[PDB]
Subunit: 114 residues, 4 copies
């Protein structure tokens, strides 16, 4: 139900071995760890959650862009990239969070389908 895809706008490639942490907003407004992993050779991170576990709520996807750039020997601007959204059952069932990275910029979109 949740996939993350990360692309590199400098090299024209997937962003490989990027750490990604997913959090769920708790009742007390803190961020509780939910899922994490490293992007694959295709820039994708699958297997984060199951349908059962991915209930409605507010989620944060934190992408460790700083470490990514530093490993490539590039000084970047951001500490990380955050994508914060609500999962809503009355919309489509599968969410892809995509991010396109540059050293001083990023873009993100949602692709939400059935």
């Amino acid at each position: 139900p949740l996939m993350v895809k990360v692309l590199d706008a400098v090299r024209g490639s997937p962003a490989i071995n990027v750490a990604v942490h997913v959090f769920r907003k708790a009742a007390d407004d803190t961020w509780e760890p939910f899922a994490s992993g490293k992007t694959s050779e295709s820039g994708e991170l699958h297997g984060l959650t199951t349908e059962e576990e991915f209930v409605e709520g507010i989620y944060k996807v934190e992408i460790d862009t700083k470490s990514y750039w530093k490993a490539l020997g590039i000084s970047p601007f951001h500490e990380h990239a955050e994508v914060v959204f609500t999962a809503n059952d009355s919309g489509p069932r599968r969410y892809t969070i995509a991010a396109l990275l540059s050293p001083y910029s990023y873009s993100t979109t949602a692709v939400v389908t059935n």
Copy 2:
């Protein structure tokens, strides 16, 4: 060797049934038709060319964004979106041209892999 992927930033979905025309720059600097099609349900257009046919050169991918928006009842800014690039054999072999559409804006990236 060549795939096109189109996404909709308004609806958070693939951009379905978008016409795409691919041209190759000729010796006389005109644009000769090369491949075309309509994006699928996943916003993708595969099967444009083969390895044999996709030789080095300058290519233009024209995405008919205006018709896309109009079919959704939206007035858009652009006539189309153009993506013009050189295919180079000394780089990786597979090219994905991705575009993210809004009524008054678009973004494009290349994902070039082996």
Copy 3:
């Protein structure tokens, strides 16, 4: 020293009346409120801070995109757009944080200049 500019990719216009909250990470690792404001009719927000007050630190610029879209009667995807960066760690710089908004997408860039 800190400017925020927001554009609307649907309307082809500045994004006007967008709420922006800036935080700075404290010693104890919490996000301390630093400054806030709203974008003007030109999509710009000036006057957030001063060179004296804008010391080195890790800053978070929270652009209230959902509030913006909801005020226009649109149901958007994201809660906000958060831009987090270290500032002034090689001495004072001027920062523009720019954002381009759509209901299911945004982009952000920084322009950093040395006065």
Copy 4:
């Protein structure tokens, strides 16, 4: 009435010295040269045209991204970024064409205002 602004997503800076060529589609369906210039130290290009000369039509703003990146010693993907639009068809408007550049990607947006 027509302004072009270009930013560099790698440097976090204006994109300076970017060549820009504007064309207008003629009656015979060819692209006629309309105006050209280069971005300043602020990444902006002003002075392309006048309200008299900027009549209705289909315009193409060609931003010479490859030339820009090559001048910086970088091998980029695209030849240029082309922005094609109908202008002034409901009377005169002011257009800003903005672009954000990376070596393998760009984004563009328009800001259209009615004076």
